[PDB]
Amino acid sequence: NRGGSFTLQPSGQLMCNGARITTSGRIITANGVDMDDFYQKYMS
Amino acid sequence: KAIHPDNVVLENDKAIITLKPDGDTSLQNPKVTVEALADGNVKISNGTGEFTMSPSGEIKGGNRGGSFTLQPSGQLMCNGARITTSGRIITANGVDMDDFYQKYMS
């Protein structure tokens, strides 16, 4: 995209400008926050 | 048989390969089309959908009910949800993951 990248790595880890979506669907944002981890702190 | 005044057309019963002097090349058939135009345009297309790249570096997927769009500025997009160059996952509802995380843990 020359300013972006719809990259898919051989291991199946979707990537876009650093943000990753693991094979298990964990949305690891570029800032390191995992959605499930942030959810767990909530609802405590 | 008729002859095209200016075109090198290699043709079969229903499969056609056309190269024009002005760079453009095209593969055609009654349900698919793969054209590469002079101006950096790629428009791989099909009846069920299409995929294209603009000269401006855009990459899009015509899911016809979805879009794997990548804008020239590197901002990944999918049905409105954006992933900025810095990896900020801005969901279509406007919520930023880091912003929501910050309110938590307070």
Side-chain angles (χ1 to χ4, degrees):
Chain A
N1 200 355
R2 209 184 284 151
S5 181
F6 307 165
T7 299
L8 175 67
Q9 285 176 97
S11 57
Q13 178 176 218
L14 285 71
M15 312 206 319
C16 180
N17 294 318
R20 293 140 288 149
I21 315 179
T22 60
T23 56
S24 192
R26 299 279 58 67
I27 301 93
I28 305 166
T29 303
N31 66 354
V33 174
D34 177 73
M35 192 175 58
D36 302 358
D37 165 88
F38 174 90
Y39 192 86
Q40 290 158 59
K41 291 154 192 155
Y42 170 85
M43 183 278 288
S44 55
Chain B
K1 200 188 186 181
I3 182 168
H4 207 301
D6 186 74
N7 265 277
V8 59
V9 178
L10 172 59
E11 181 255 340
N12 193 38
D13 56 25
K14 74 212 171 283
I16 297 169
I17 303 192
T18 305
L19 288 69
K20 304 142 271 183
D22 79 356
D24 302 336
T25 79
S26 298
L27 201 173
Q28 301 89 337
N29 69 6
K31 54 161 278 173
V32 185
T33 301
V34 177
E35 62 167 59
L37 309 187
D39 308 290
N41 293 93
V42 176
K43 195 199 66 58
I44 297 162
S45 168
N46 173 248
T48 70
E50 62 84 16
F51 167 95
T52 187
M53 298 181 39
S54 169
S56 190
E58 291 207 279
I59 305 175
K60 314 175 192 270
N63 200 355
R64 209 184 284 151
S67 181
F68 307 165
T69 299
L70 175 67
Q71 285 176 97
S73 57
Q75 178 176 218
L76 285 71
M77 312 206 319
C78 180
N79 294 318
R82 293 140 288 149
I83 315 179
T84 60
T85 56
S86 192
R88 299 279 58 67
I89 301 93
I90 305 166
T91 303
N93 66 354
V95 174
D96 177 73
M97 192 175 58
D98 302 358
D99 165 88
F100 174 90
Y101 192 86
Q102 290 158 59
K103 291 154 192 155
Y104 170 85
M105 183 278 288
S106 55

